[PDB]
Amino acid sequence: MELSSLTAVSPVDGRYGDKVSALRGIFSEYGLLKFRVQVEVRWLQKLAAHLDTLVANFNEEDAARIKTIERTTNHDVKAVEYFLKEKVAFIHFACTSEDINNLSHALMLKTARDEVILPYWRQVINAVKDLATQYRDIPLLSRTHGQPATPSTLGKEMANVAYRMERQFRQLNQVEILGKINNAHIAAYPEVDWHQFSEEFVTSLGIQWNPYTTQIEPHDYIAELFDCIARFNTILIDFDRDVWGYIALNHFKQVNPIDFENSEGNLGLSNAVLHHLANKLTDSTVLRNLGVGIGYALIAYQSTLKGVSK
Amino acid sequence: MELSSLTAVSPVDGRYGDKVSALRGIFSEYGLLKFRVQVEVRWLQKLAAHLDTLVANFNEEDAARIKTIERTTNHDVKAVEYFLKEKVAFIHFACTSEDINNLSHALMLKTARDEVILPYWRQVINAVKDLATQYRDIPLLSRTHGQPATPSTLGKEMANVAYRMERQFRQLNQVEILGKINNAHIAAYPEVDWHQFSEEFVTSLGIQWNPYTTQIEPHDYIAELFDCIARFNTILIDFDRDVWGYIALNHFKQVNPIDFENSEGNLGLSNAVLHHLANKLTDSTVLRNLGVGIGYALIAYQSTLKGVSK
Amino acid sequence: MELSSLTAVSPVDGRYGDKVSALRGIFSEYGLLKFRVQVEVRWLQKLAAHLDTLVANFNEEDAARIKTIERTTNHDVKAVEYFLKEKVAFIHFACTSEDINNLSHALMLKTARDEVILPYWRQVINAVKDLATQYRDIPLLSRTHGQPATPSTLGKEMANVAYRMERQFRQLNQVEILGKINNAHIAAYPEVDWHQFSEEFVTSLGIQWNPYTTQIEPHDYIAELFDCIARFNTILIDFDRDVWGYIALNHFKQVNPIDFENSEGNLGLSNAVLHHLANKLTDSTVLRNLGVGIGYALIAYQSTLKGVSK
Amino acid sequence: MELSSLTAVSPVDGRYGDKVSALRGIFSEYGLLKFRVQVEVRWLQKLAAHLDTLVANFNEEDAARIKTIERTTNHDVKAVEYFLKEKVAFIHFACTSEDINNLSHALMLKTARDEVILPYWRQVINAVKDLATQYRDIPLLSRTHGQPATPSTLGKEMANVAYRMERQFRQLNQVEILGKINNAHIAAYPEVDWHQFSEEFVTSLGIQWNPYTTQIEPHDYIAELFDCIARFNTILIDFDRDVWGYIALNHFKQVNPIDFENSEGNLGLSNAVLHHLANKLTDSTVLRNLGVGIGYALIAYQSTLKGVSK
């Protein structure tokens, strides 16, 4: 009834509470708060048109603060207003929102992609490029003698997998994560080219910018990212079914193919959730589970990485 | 980076760490251990063919014990052997396994169904039977004047939902959760009708028994249970889309339909995972996530129950 | 550009136009018409409260008739009214509808289940019971010498599959397909106990009856049937992966495992569509594709039946 | 029991046998034959390193020919050899295969994308750009007076949909469909730079080429294409739920939202099948149903295009 890695319900928090740990900074109740205040703060650095203290000095303590300092206010939304206003101990009192809220989502997605998914995919690709250039010459399949279909080398056929994985690498990554902006207030600022303060802003967050107009943050480049991870994830399950399978056959002489079964296990689950979330039409419940389907691929990766080493 | 309801990755452990709390006793790393030792212990009460101390006095402390007292032994499986053997401080030393391992899975599923899913479904049905017999006379749809299609009362059309929910109640519940049994050891027991010690045993666990032979614990009555929850879950999303929808229209005069959107949200996710797990062909990774898809329906229920009250 | 088995788009009409042929009588544009007029005619046999000519003498010719004799009328629905009224060449002129429309759907589903799905499942079960009692003694897996996991006989492990298939047989079949009834017209009939003419009617169609009230033909016992076929279908894919797999290994000496791959192929597609349709919330588009997901299992069956014979 | 649009089982062949007609040239048993002989013939134009008669003069008649002239030969595969060899009535007798077989699949996919999916998407985008610039000024939602959430114009919010659709247009289309090549025979040709005859060849088919090596036609750019159509398809269902929905509200005064329900209907089915096929790991059964999930989007499009006009 407590709540730890032992008594957790989902494995991403439980069995694999850690090393999947990195998602805690991004998709937990904390994560998305940590992300939303940053941005809505990095903008108030707006005041420079006239430092980064709390965007960095922020933890579960001020996420708990914003949590306790909600559930009292008579407006439901804009609880974040009073917190940032609390840590004001000046005439900074401008709390515009909304497009900023998208930038949040973009940034968390952006960070997931660049600082976890990709670094994982790269370990996985590399370990496949080794296990191939090591199994060069090791023949496969066909049908002994008296039948062919197709004869190759387990190594060359593992090279293709690394190559397929390489394409979904490039495919992730070229998924465009966009953003843009555009009160009776901001006319305290008569000296700025607001398109520009905006382009400068968005960009400063490492988001790609702006127009064609500014209206549609269709806001499902999530679909695009997730159909891609799941494309990669499927490539990996294919890889999983090769090792476990080859070591099914190398059990005709005299290693535990566990890990390749697990990796398969979790990948089917990533994909399940990932796809689900990707085809669902503020998406706060979709938003609150962006990290789950991702949490599942990390397990699969740490598990494939684990097999191999063997 | 810590690990609590704030920094959890999945919402079942995080935002809804609690009241979904009850799954912690069943599907966590703890749960399934708690379940596997019970059974493999309630059998050793076998020795009665000649009390329930630790099956009851068991917690995260001895799940941590079995966890630390694994990862050292040179056999990987049967870590559970040494623990039960440790708490032996007599000639009880018979540690048969396997069919017992199925009984574990049956029992946890059994307990989930009888002590959480059903008590939840019943709250949900009741609250639908109220909101109907309260909205009697409230008309709906058709098309004002100049068009019909079909005209009823929001209340009678909510009665059907309660009735549909009633059928999936009966349908869950009549899903049969089976079990059976059948060393050079047990010939210390020359005085028992083993079929009978077995039928008595299985049954004593409240599992339904035995033969036609004993060979196939096909072991996916999980499919059967899960296609049923997800049938119910879909009925509820239908209900969700009625309230949110009616209160879309009752916003033509002068309540937050949040909760009915959430309930919808999580139910689509239960179903996603639930179905996934149900169509996957020892299933330890499937096993380790039996509680997730279920964890998601509980949120949906607590959320529908929450709307209504309004 | 023509339209035959060669130039068809979907395989159920194309490659397997035939032997899957039997669905043409049920789920085609024809089928559901054939079904809706029957019922809405077998009722007019109502006039007996005072023979079966066209319910039997009905073909593509009068389905074409009802098709041409639609697309002209200025009401869209009730095109079926004018056709039955045409073949009136007396004072039978009472054309009540609606609950009758459900009975149609029930009956087509009913007929699919009793006259095609089940007769197929039974062939499939039998052929598994042979291939098992023929492979008795043939050992399997484990890991030669120096490793076990679990050692059995390919035959006993095929018996379980037949047994699992047997349970989903019984499970289909006990899915309840319900129906019920209940103008200023029918008061030409002052001499009938209408509840009774109704119970007699429904029942006469071999539908199970009536009340608890009469309001909710929840009308997704389709879900229930389809989660069941797909449960069975998955059992079969499991079987498929055993033969293709065993004959992967029996290719260590000196038959084409095609058919077991195909059967797998189509079953994944049945299930895809079947599940889809089952979780979708008049369902005319769902209605118009009830036979597709089913069309796909038949291929899988004819294909598994085909392998085996080998 | 015959086989036409009336008695077809699937709607793509049946109710919508036509205008979906165009897929008959591509994904039917005919299609893929028509495609495989072309290519394996356009190559024999190889002999130019020393016209297009039958690649153009090919119909159901020679697909029937290749069908009858199979089922007799004692090799199962290479039935296509004897047919092309039949229509030899010179020393052209070189029948290399395999990489050519991929080029076939690429080309059919290529043609589907450029000559049907895209021309459809473009009609759909345009009709959305009209229905928006026509509904400019028409306000929406919020909550009359006493509640907001967010207030816009049905027209501007339809512009975003056209814009979202535009991105998946560009996204399809930039999906790379690749190909490459590389007997004791071709040493009748000592005068050609074979890499080049190959690059020239592939390219001549409008396939993108070649190396990085030539080994992995991973051969699921199908995944990539299909996650994209289904991304678009989902955008459209979103659009569907806007019109049907707005005309739910415009039924508060005094048109049939059918078509927008249908389009929704079929799109969920495309996506179901499309996704299915996309996540399945020679794929002849996957291959034989490439046109189904696509057949379903066309209906959805012809249906959305149909609503609108209203």
In chain B, residues with a C-beta closer than 8 Å to the C-beta of C213 are 163
Integer Cα distance of B180 and B100 in angstroms: 9
Using a CB-CB cut-off of 8 Å, the residues of chain A touching B262 are: 284-285
Q: How far is CA A174 from CA A123, A205, D284, in A?
A: 19, 17, 32
Task: Report the alpha-carbon distance of residue A105 to residue A277 in Å, rounded.
Answer: 14
Q: Neighbouring chains of D at 3+ CB pairs within 8 Å?
A: A, B, C
| Residues ≥6 apart with Cβ < 8 Å to C206 | C107, C110
Pairwise CA distance, residues D127 & D309, whole Å: 9
Q: Cα–Cα distance between A95 and A90 in angstroms, integer?
A: 13
Q: What angle do CA C184, C185, C187 make, to 5 degrees?
A: 90
Report the distance separating Cα C289 and Cα D290, nearest Å. 18
Give the Cα separation of C124 and C243 in Å (integer): 14
Among candidates C108, C54, C104, which has minimal Cα distance to C83? Answer: C54
Query: Are A175 and A225 spatial neighbours (Cβ–Cβ below 8 Å)?
Result: yes
Between the CA of residue C283 and those of B271, B300, C102, D5, what are the distances in Å?
Answer: 21, 26, 11, 21
Q: How far apart are CA A226 and CA A119, in angstroms?
A: 16
Count CB-CB contacts under 10 A for residue C234: 22
Q: Which of A1, A262, A285, A287 to mutate to test the interface with B (most CBs of B within 10 A)?
A: A285
Cα A83 to Cα A64: distance, rounded to the nearest angstrom: 11
Locate the DSSP E strands across chain D: 178-179, 208-209
Quick check: D300 and D281 in contact, CB under 8 A? Answer: no
Q: Establish, for the pair of chains A and D, how many residue pairs have beta carbons separated by less than 8 Å.
A: 68
Task: For residue A254, count CB atoms less than 10 angstroms from its CB and return exposed for 0-12, middle for 13-18, buried for 19 or more.
Answer: exposed
Phi-psi region at D245: left, alpha or beta (left = phi > 0; alpha = psi -120 to 50):
left
CA end-to-end span of chain C: 38
How many pairs of residues across A and C have Cβ atoms under 8 Å apart? 17
Nearest Cα neighbor of C207 from C108, C119, C132, C120 is: C108
Judge contact between A235 and A134, C-beta under 8 A. no
Both tokens of A143, joined, read 């049908």
Q: What angle do CA B205, B210, B214 make, to 5 degrees?
A: 130
For residues A304 and A124, the answer to whether their CB atoms sit within 8 Å is: yes
C-chain residue closest to A250, CA distance = C143
C28 token code pair: 């085609």
Question: What is d(CA D305, CA D25) in angstroms, rounded to the nearest whole number?
Answer: 23
Burial class of residue A215 (count of CB atoms within 10 Å of its CB; 0-12, 13-18, 19+): middle
> Are B270 and B229 spatial neighbours (Cβ–Cβ below 8 Å)?
yes
* Cross-chain Cβ contact D215/A159 below 8 Å: yes
CA distances from C119 to C115, C273, D81 (A): 6, 21, 40
Q: Which residue has the tokens 């002989």?
A: D37
Of C171, C218, C235, the CB nearest to B160: C218
- Cβ neighbours of residue A247 under 8 Å, at least 6 residues apart? A255, A257, A260
Residue C86 to residue C82: CA distance in whole angstroms:
6
Q: Is D142 helix (H, G, I), strand (E, B) or coil?
A: coil
Q: Cα A208–A213–A215 angle (5° rounding)?
A: 90
Q: Both tokens of residue A162?
A: 């690394």
Please say whether the dihedral angle defined by the alpha carbons of residues A219, A220, A222 and A225, taken in this order, is positive or negative.
negative
Please state, in angstroms and as integers, the Cα–Cα distance from residue D5 to each residue in A133, B86, C289, D294, following that order: 55, 73, 14, 18
Task: Looking at B7-98, list the stretches that DSSP marks H as alpha helix, in order from N- to C-terminal side.
Answer: 24-27, 29-40, 60-68, 79-86
Note whether C224 and C178 are within 8 A (CB). no
- What is the Cα gyration radius of chain A? 24
Q: How many helices (H) and strands (E) does chain A have?
A: 12, 2
Angle between helices A79-86 and A29-40 (to 10 degrees): 60
Q: At what angle do helices D118-132 and D290-306 cross, to 10 degrees?
A: 30
- C240 chain-B contacts, CB cut-off 8 A: none
Q: Which residues contact residue A192 at a Cβ distance below 8 angstroms, ignoring those fewer than 6 apart?
A: A49
In this structure, how many other beta carbons lie within 10 angstroms of the beta carbon of residue B170? 9
DSSP for residue A188: T
Q: Say how many Å lie between the first and final Cα of chain B, rounded.
A: 38
Name the 3-class secondary structure at B211. coil
The DSSP annotation for C132-192 comes to: HTTTTT-B--TTTTT--S---BTTHHHHHHHHHHHHHHHHTTSS--EE-----SSTT--SS
Counting beta carbons within 10 angstroms of the beta carbon of residue D50, is it exposed (0 to 12), middle (13 to 18) or buried (19 or more)? exposed
d(CA C266, CA B170): 33
DSSP, collapsed to helix, strand or coil, labels residue D214 as coil
Q: Are B221 and C171 in contact (CB under 8 A)?
A: no
> How many CB atoms neighbour CB B119 within 10 A?
12
8 Å CB contact between A298 and A274: no
Q: Which of 103-122 (C) contact D at CB < 8 A?
A: none
For chain B, the farthest-separated pair of C-alpha atoms sits apart, in whole angstroms, at: 86
Query: Resolution in angstroms for this experimental structure?
Result: 2.7
* Cβ burial B62-95 (10 Å sphere, 16+ → b, else e): bbebbbeeeeeeeeeeeebeebbeeeeeeeeeeb
Contact status of D147 with chain B (Cβ, < 8 Å)? yes
**How far, in whole angstroms, is CA A169 from its chain's centroid?**
14
The alpha helices in B41-98, defined as continuous H runs, are: 60-68, 79-86
Distance CA A131, CA A127 (A): 6
CA gap C22, B103 in Å, rounded? 43
Tokens of B205: 């666990």
Distance, CA of C298 to CA of D9 (rounded, Å): 12
Sign of the CA dihedral running A138, A143, A145, A147: negative
Contact between C142 and A251 under an 8 Å Cβ cutoff? The reply is no
Query: How long a stretch of residues is chain B?
Result: 310
B225 to B117, B132, B171, B304, C297: CA distances (angstroms):
11, 28, 9, 22, 23
Helix extents (H) in A172-289 = 194-204, 222-249, 260-279, 284-287
A213: tokens are 């107009």
Q: Give the DSSP per-residue string, D13-73.
A: TTTT-SSSGGGHHHHSHHHHHHHHHHHHTTTGGGGG-----TTTS--HHHHHHHHHTSSSS
Q: Give the helix/strand (H/E) hosting C208.
A: strand C208-209
> How many helices (H) and strands (E) in chain B?
12, 2
A286 and chain D in contact, CB less than 8 A: no
| Alpha carbon distances (Å) from A5 to A282, B2, B13, B64, B78 | 31, 11, 10, 10, 22
Q: Which residues of chain A come before a gap where C and the next N are over 2.5 Å apart?
A: 50, 89, 182, 254, 281
Which technique was used to obtain these atomic coordinates?
X-ray
d(CA C195, CA A222): 56
For A266, the 3-state DSSP assignment is helix
Contact B168, B236 (CB under 8 A): no
Q: Is B156 on the interface with C (CB under 8 A)?
A: yes
Neighbours of D16 (CB within 10 A): 22
Cβ within 8 Å, pair B10-A76: no
The residue assigned the tokens 């999916």 is D117
Instruction: Give the whole-angstrom CA distance, residue D196 versus residue A237.
Output: 36
Reported as type and span, the H/E element at residue A123 is helix A118-132
> Does the CB of C171 have a partner CB in chain B at under 8 Å?
yes
DSSP letters, B216-246, are: -----SHHHHHHHHHHHHHHHHHHHHHHHHH
Q: Among candidates A145, A209, A151, which has minimal Cα distance to A178?
A: A209
- What is the Cα–Cα distance from A27 to A287, expressed in whole angstroms? 9
Half-sphere exposure of B134 (CA within 13 A, CB side): 10
Distance between CA atoms of residues C234 and C164, nearest Å: 10
| Cα gap A92→A46, rounded to integer Å | 9
**Nearest CB to D147; choose among B144, B145, B251:** B251
Chain D interface includes A237 (CB < 8 A): yes
> Which residues contact residue B307 at a Cβ distance below 8 angstroms, ignoring those fewer than 6 apart?
B243, B244, B257, B258, B259, B260, B263
Amino acid at residue number C264: E
Helix axes D29-40, D79-86, angle to 10 degrees: 60
Q: Which residues, 6+ apart, have CB-to-CB distance to C182 below 8 Å?
A: C99, C194, C195, C198, C214
Tracing tokens 């629905």 back to the chain, one arrives at C77
CA of D162 to nearest chain A CA: how many angstroms apart?
Answer: 10
Q: Give residues 55 to 84 of C whose Cβ lies within 8 Å of D.
A: 60, 63-64, 67, 76
**Cα–Cα dist A19/A32, whole Å:** 19
Residue of chain A minimizing CA distance to D174: A171
User: How is residue A47 annotated by DSSP?
Assistant: G
Q: List Cα–Cα distances, B104 to B34, B97, B201, C73, in angstroms.
A: 9, 11, 13, 64
Structure tokens at C277: 């349709």
CA distances from D234 to B26, D245, D306 (A): 38, 16, 18
Torsion of CA B293, C275, C167, B205, to 10 degrees: 10
What are chain B's partners, defined as 3 or more CB pairs within 8 angstroms?
A: A, C, D
Q: What are phi and psi of C209, to 5 degrees?
A: -100, 150
Contact D290, D222 (CB under 8 A): yes
The nearest CA of chain D is from the CA of A279 a distance in Å of 7
Tokens found for residue A185: 């207030």
- Compute the radius of gyration of chain C from its Cα atoms: 24
How many CB pairs (< 8 A) connect A and B?
153
The contacts found for B93-99 with CB under 8 angstroms, 24 or more apart, are B94/B44, B94/B46, B94/B183, B94/B185, B94/B186, B94/B188, B95/B40, B96/B43, B96/B183, B96/B185, B96/B186, B97/B40, B99/B179, B99/B180, B99/B181, B99/B182, B99/B214, B99/B217
Q: At what angle do helices B118-132 and B156-171 cross, to 10 degrees?
A: 160
- Per DSSP, helices labelled H in chain C are 24-27, 29-40, 60-68, 79-86, 99-112, 118-132, 156-171, 194-204, 222-249, 260-279, 284-287, 290-306
- Most distant CA pair in chain C, distance: 86
Q: What would the two tokens of residue A64 be? A: 């708990």
Query: Which residue type sits at B20?
Result: V
E strand spans, chain B: 178-179, 208-209
